[PDB]
PDB file of C-alpha atoms in Angstrom:
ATOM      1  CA  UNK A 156       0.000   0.000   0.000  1.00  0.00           C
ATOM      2  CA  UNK A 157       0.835   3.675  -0.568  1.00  0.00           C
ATOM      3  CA  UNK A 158       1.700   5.196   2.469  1.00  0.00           C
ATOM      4  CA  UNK A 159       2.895   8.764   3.546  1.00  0.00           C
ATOM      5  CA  UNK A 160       6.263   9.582   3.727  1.00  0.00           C
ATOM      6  CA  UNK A 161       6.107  13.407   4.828  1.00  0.00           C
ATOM      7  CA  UNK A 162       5.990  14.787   2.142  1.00  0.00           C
ATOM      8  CA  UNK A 163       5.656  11.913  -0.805  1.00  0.00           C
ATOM      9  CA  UNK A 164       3.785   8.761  -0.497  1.00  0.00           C
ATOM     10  CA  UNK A 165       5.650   4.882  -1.114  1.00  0.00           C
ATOM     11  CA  UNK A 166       4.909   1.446  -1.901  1.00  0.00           C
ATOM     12  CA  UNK A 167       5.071  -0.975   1.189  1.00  0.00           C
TER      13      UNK A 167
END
């Protein structure tokens, strides 16, 4: 899932 990354989301 896309989570937030503080200021972009990524892929776990």
């Amino acid at each position: 899932s896309w989570t937030w990354e503080g200021n972009k989301w990524t892929w776990k």
